[PDB]
């Protein structure tokens, strides 16, 4: 029947950005119209495809990538960004055709005295490849001296907590982000809209 958009946007659990969730959506029909119109989503920006023309188009694969970040960091979910989220947590490709949907979730993903459940990676030796996921927890060597698995002077634990409080201003608030990833190949199409 219809592609399962209830399962991705109204999921009970949203992942931390370093451990982002990829659900694959294939072999169904998808009405993106109700999503674009909804004022629930503050951010709904598409790259390389018009938001009007979503129900016309046909794609080989559509992936749903979903995670929770800070409100400032929503800027980094775009092709050709840099920053701690784009370099070390979630990287889009340069040739990214797809849509970035985000909304505020301050009321669910903050509790009083901080929500320490959501983390982000702060250092990595290289920047990530596109759509790469790192859940490693080795100590980052920031200095000349080797780390021996211990948080030391120039030896740092790579995952940092957001620690979302509701008293934080809007830039430091939890936003849930869904990334729709349209892949086009020389393969046959699997997901078209209602109008095709």
């Amino acid at each position, epitope marked *: 029947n219809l592609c399962p958009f209830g399962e991705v946007f109204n999921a009970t*659990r949203f992942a931390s950005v370093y451990a982002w969730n990829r659900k694959r959506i294939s072999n169904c029909v998808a009405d993106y119209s109700v999503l674009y119109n909804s004022a629930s989503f503050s951010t709904f920006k598409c790259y390389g495809v018009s938001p009007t023309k979503l129900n016309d188009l046909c794609f080989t694969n559509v992936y749903a990538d979903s995670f929770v970040i800070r409100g400032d960091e929503v800027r980094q979910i775009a092709p050709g960004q840099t920053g701690k989220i784009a370099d070390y947590n979630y990287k889009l490709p340069d040739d990214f055709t797809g849509c970035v949907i985000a909304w505020n979730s301050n009321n669910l993903d903050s509790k009083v005295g901080g929500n320490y459940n959501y983390l982000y990676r702060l250092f990595r030796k290289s920047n990530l490849k596109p759509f790469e996921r790192d*859940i490693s927890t080795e100590i980052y060597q920031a200095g000349s001296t080797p780390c021996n698995g211990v948080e030391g002077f120039n030896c740092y634990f790579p995952l940092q907590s957001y620690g979302f409080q509701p008293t934080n201003g809007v830039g430091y608030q939890p936003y849930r982000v869904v990334v729709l990833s349209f892949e086009l190949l020389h393969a046959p199409a699997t997901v078209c809209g209602p109008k095709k």
Partner: nanobody, 114 residues
Framework: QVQLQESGGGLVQAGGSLRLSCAAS????????MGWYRQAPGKQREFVAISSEGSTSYAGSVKGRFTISRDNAKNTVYLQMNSLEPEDTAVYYC?????????WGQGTQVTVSA
């Protein structure tokens, strides 16, 4: 859905030991990341000991005191907590990360008196 079975904890004398366990069910925990984080009251939650697939990794004050082990067969991670000090009083939460999500335990209270 995925669940985590935290077990262990309670009160101990300073210099005492403990052992925490966290057993994982509901998913594929091949090459997964398992270990413990602690939150003393009013402080930020900070990490204690953790194994991702490449390396295991320990907090600064617990090297030599605490030891992390897992058997992949039972999908359980263990934390042998020796030489306990009243600084170590915190709620201890296990963290399991599979291919799809990071999951947290509910938290076992560990309390050390002088």
């Amino acid at each position: 859905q995925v669940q985590l079975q935290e077990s262990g904890g309670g009160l101990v004398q300073a210099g005492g030991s403990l052992r925490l366990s966290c057993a994982a069910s509901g998913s594929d925990f091949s090459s997964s990341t398992m270990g413990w984080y602690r939150q003393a009251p009013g402080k930020q939650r900070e990490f204690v000991a953790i194994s991702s697939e490449g390396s295991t990794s320990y907090a600064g004050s617990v090297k030599g005191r605490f030891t992390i082990s897992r058997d992949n067969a039972k999908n359980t991670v263990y934390l042998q907590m020796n030489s306990l000090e009243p600084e170590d009083t915190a709620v201890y939460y296990c963290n399991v990360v599979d291919r799809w999500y990071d999951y947290w335990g509910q938290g076992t209270q560990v309390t050390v008196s002088a």
